[PDB]
Design a protein around this ligand. Structure first.
Ligand SMILES: OC[C@H]1O[C@@H](S[C@@H]2O[C@H](CO)[C@H](O)[C@H](n3cc(-c4ccsc4)nn3)[C@H]2O)[C@H](O)[C@@H](n2cc(-c3ccsc3)nn2)[C@H]1O
Ligand SMILES: OC[C@H]1O[C@@H](S[C@@H]2O[C@H](CO)[C@H](O)[C@H](n3cc(-c4ccsc4)nn3)[C@H]2O)[C@H](O)[C@@H](n2cc(-c3ccsc3)nn2)[C@H]1O
Lengths: 134, 134
């Protein structure tokens, strides 16, 4: 809503989106949304420090034609409130791969089968400093 | 327009936007548009290598509620086709200042007196690699 929105990204399979930002000292959560547009998201990436009953959990989901998909959570949580955080995303036909701080990586199934990622929105307690394409 | 569009930038006076991109190998021109939205641009920055009868000339303009303003042209042209260009943009009450690390500096009057820059668009023969806020 107040976070950075970017469109016409034209990110193709195998290309790296690198995002760096500042996690607020009192962060509750933040969101990186990636897909075609606000209703069609091949990845909703939502680290929760303390939000919706979740402590230090990464929640991921997709959104297809307005409808949220089946949620998935990861065990690993390498984000700290009040510090700078970089996240690196790529995709292929089968999966999105997200590489985190501390060398941590995980896959989320690609559920939309889009030609490219064209849309990104940040929200929550995360101030983007830097976005790069590779 | 078909290159990157970014909104909710909330760049305030004194803050630096840095953009790095690739100038196509037979570039005719590129555009960086900065402002409130597509119809309200405090800076339309348009380096022309060979386009609309202009050769190696920078053309700047504003747009205010859909209406183009008066063109301002600059003599110096520190860009080359097929290379990497970095541009640093800031503003204050009187002027926008477009800077290059190579020491070139252009001023354009701040004709719209907007309080923040919230919108940035790239078009033409220029691919954005990196955008940073500080
Ligand atoms: O239908 C109810 C569900 O609500 C969702 S919360 C919902 O989830 C979305 C992604 O699936 C987005 O993340 C959506 N969001 C968050 C933001 C946001 C965050 C920061 S700025 C904007 N912008 N949209 C956020 O509101 C919980 O995750 C679900 N849940 C809870 C638990 C649980 C609790 C304790 S132990 C297990 N297990 N599943 C369940 O309760
Ligand atoms: O309508 C006629 C005028 O057209 C404009 S071109 C018009 O100008 C805009 C900013 O004023 C934008 O730049 C606009 N653009 C360019 C792009 C673009 C570029 C790359 S991707 C998209 N997206 N909009 C671009 O179409 C010429 O500039 C005018 N001109 C040139 C000269 C001249 C020649 C030698 S000395 C003086 N004397 N008049 C004149 O011909």
């Amino acid at each position: 809503a107040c976070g950075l929105v970017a469109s016409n990204l034209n990110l193709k399979p195998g290309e790296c989106l690198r995002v760096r930002g500042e996690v607020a000292p009192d962060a509750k959560s933040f969101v990186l949304n990636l897909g075609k547009d606000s209703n069609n998201l091949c990845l909703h990436f939502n680290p929760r420090f303390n939000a919706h009953g979740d402590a230090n959990t990464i929640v991921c989901n997709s959104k297809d034609g307005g409808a949220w998909g089946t949620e998935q959570r990861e065990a690993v949580f390498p984000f700290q409130p009040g510090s700078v955080a970089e996240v690196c995303i790529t995709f292929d036909q089968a999966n999105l791969t997200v590489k985190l701080p501390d060398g941590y990586e995980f896959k989320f199934p690609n559920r939309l089968n889009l030609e490219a990622i064209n849309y990104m929105a940040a929200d929550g307690d995360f101030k983007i400093k830097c976005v790069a394409f590779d």
